[PDB]
Amino acid sequence: AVGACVLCNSQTSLRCGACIRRPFLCCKCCYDHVISTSHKLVLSVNPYVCNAPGCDVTDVTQLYLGGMSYYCKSHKPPISFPLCANGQVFGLYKVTDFNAIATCDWTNAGDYILANTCTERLKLFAAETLKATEETFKLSYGIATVREVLSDRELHLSWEVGKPRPPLNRNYVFTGYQIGEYTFEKDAVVYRGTTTYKLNVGDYFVLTSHTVMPLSAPTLVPQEHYVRITGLYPTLNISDEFSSNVANYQKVGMQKYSTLQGPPGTGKSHFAIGLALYYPSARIVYTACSHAAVDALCEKALKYLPIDKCSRIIPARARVECFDKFKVNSTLEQYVFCTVNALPETTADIVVFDEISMATNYDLSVVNARLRAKHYVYIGDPAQLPAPRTLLTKGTLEPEYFNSVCRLMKTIGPDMFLGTCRRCPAEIVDTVSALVYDNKLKAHKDKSAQCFKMFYKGVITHDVSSAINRPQIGVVREFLTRNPAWRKAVFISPYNSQNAVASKILGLPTQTVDSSQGSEYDYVIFTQTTETAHSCNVNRFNVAITRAKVGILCIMSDRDLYDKLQFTSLEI
Ligand SMILES: O=C(NO)c1ccc2ccccc2n1
Ligand SMILES: [Zn+2]
Ligand SMILES: [Zn+2]
Ligand SMILES: [Zn+2]
Structure with missing residues (x-):
């Protein structure tokens, strides 16, 4: 009942009763809120409601203080003060952006834009309010x-x-x-x-209707810049494998946090595990939102780091099968691999947070709350897919608004940029470099001459809302008869319904663009299915085509993205 204001930390007994998170609001900020929003219920030790029997006046603007009690305009005593006067709401110890976050339905993109452009404490309020609105929506x-x-x-x-x-x-x-x-x-x-x-x-x-816990720690800790490597101890015997990242590892020890933008196949996993070999005494906690992202980091550590000093943290309510080679749930091992939601309350010399575009501000804050580290490292790519925002229907969410880290990477730029793609044929690297990386992504492989594009709109059917394009699957079937080397290809599309139809007809392994992120395959067959805003999204497009090591076949619906593909055009 007594805490600090979510807008200026001025201690107060007031909390907004109309907010779903009931934030503490100081006399000055509480007024600015109730006088501009539909929110008029103010909570203290006792609520601000009319004490007169059977009176239902609960609006703080229609209430007054009768000695030490509260009454409306009809029940107040001769000597009473309105609770709202001189820009304040009466309380002990005596913003337009807070009003918008507290009242929005989270169905518009401008809601998420604001949740990231606001102050730091408002970013946590926005994150709590959003997550609680996402869970109350589950009761529907x-x-x-x-x-x-x-x-x-x-x-x-x-x-x-x-x-x-x-x-x-x-x-x-x-x-x-x-x-x-x-x-x-x-x-x-x-x-x-x-x-x-x-x-x-x-x-x-x-x-799954889960309860939203409050956020305490910031999305990003305040930045510190040091004159030498702090609390970390470098090696001199450093494997030539990791010599390319030595300068960037040193920058990691000379800053509180550091951002690494790594396009597909530029060596993000390699960078993360090499940081452990560079500071070999340092205790590192490897974290990410998904079990797959944490598991990918485990595969790289198994190859370079001692399996005894590694541990994979798995929560009791085990939803998916995880990495099985490290000792399980040993919080004390030098290297700890764990998802954000299962992180124990521990400390580390370095915390590495991978697949940073998939993180929300809720996740950023949780990591700062469960882990107290000397250095924080955010690895990812704002040109890749963000976390799904289930309430957002109106507008498109831009990369500088995925989270605080992506906002930093898109505005001030990342601290470190892995600029050479080792995975993709040059046709794919040249296309995505121009599409999302401002021509800064360089190709290491030559052109494979196995990257094709076919402009075929076909026919669009809908299983509820997940789209299907049987003529595009038929075009793939016809291509496979003439191209048996493509028998070993993974089929990708922006829709699971398309993937279900393609799995029955083609028999190829299936992946949506969103579930393919992080993985690589020699051959990829991609059907765009529709020319909606979902299938034309450049981050999803970038992910779809950067999965290929050798060849890609793109059956396109959007002329714009078809014309942008620097692939060999096919006919039929
Ligand atoms: O070892 C790696 N993964 O197997 C890897 C991937 C990509 C790289 C890109 C540039 C430099 C180094 C790289 N290293
Ligand atoms: Zn305040
Ligand atoms: Zn409110
Ligand atoms: Zn009354």
Whole structure:
């Protein structure tokens, strides 16, 4: 009931009762808020409401102080002071951006733009409010009850009337009952639970409604610049493998935090594990939002770092299968690999946070709260995919607004830039360099002469909203007959429904653009499916085509992105 103002830290008993996070607001800032928003309920030890029996006046602008009690204009005593006077709300110990964050529905892009351009304390308020609004929104969808169990990987379901049905993709992990978490894909719905239980008919699955904890630590700690490497001890016997990053590792020891922008295949994993070989005594915590990103870092460490000094932290509510070669849950091992949401309360000499475009300000703050380190290193690429914002429907979110780190990388630029792509054929590197990296990404490989583009709009069908283009899958099928080396290709598309149709017809392994991020394949077959804002997104486009080591076939719908592709044009 007594804390500090979320706008100027001025100690106060006042909290906004109309805010879903009930932030402490000082007399000056509380007034500026209630006089401009629909928010008029003010909370103290006792609420600011009319004390007169059966009176429902709760608006602080319509209330007055009767000695030590509160009353409306109809019930106030002769000697009373309005709670709102001279730019203040009465309380003990006696902003336009805060009003917008506190009242927005988080469905517009301008809401997220503001959540990142605001002050630091408002970035945490925006992050808490957004995350709590994302969870209260989970109470809105309808329950699915089992009607029939077809097999071990398929079932038929009954849906709740009056409440809408949620998107059937691997993104929306349902929580079933206490049989564990369960996922779905499209009347024969394919079921895939984290736990393998012979599902009983009549059982029900409901979405993961978790409670949002408050944020204390900033998204980014205040920057410090040092004259020498601080708290870290370099090697002199440094493997020629990592000699290219020595100057950047030294810059890491001479700053509190450092940003590394690394386009696809420029050596981000290599940079992260080499930093451990450069400061060999340093205790490093490797973190990322996804289990896949943390696992990718584990594969690189297995190759260069002693397997005994490594540990993979796995939480009890195990949703996906993880890295199995390190000792599990040993918080004290020199090298700790763990996802943001499972981080223990520990300290480190260096913290490395990878796949930084996928992080939210909620995640940035959590890392600063659970880990107290001498140095922080943010590795990622603002030209790659951000975390999905489930409430955002109106407008497109730009990279300088993904999180505080991406905002820094897109405005002041990154501290370090890995400029040479070692993975992709030159056709792909030249296209993405011009598309998203301002011609600064250089190709290490020559042109493979296996990068093709075909302009084919086909026919667009929709399974609810995930789009399908059967003629584009047919064009791929025709190409494969004439190109058997492409038999070993991974099929990629912006839609899971397209991928389900392509897996049945082509039999190729399948990946959405979003789930392909971080991975690499010799051959990639990409069908754009539609020319929507989703499939034409340049960050998704950049990710889609930078998955290929040898060859890529792009069946395009957008003339703009087709014309930008510096690939060999095909006909049929
Ligand atoms: O070792 C690596 N991964 O296997 C790697 C990848 C990409 C690189 C790019 C430039 C310099 C070095 C690199 N190293
Ligand atoms: Zn204040
Ligand atoms: Zn409010
Ligand atoms: Zn009253």
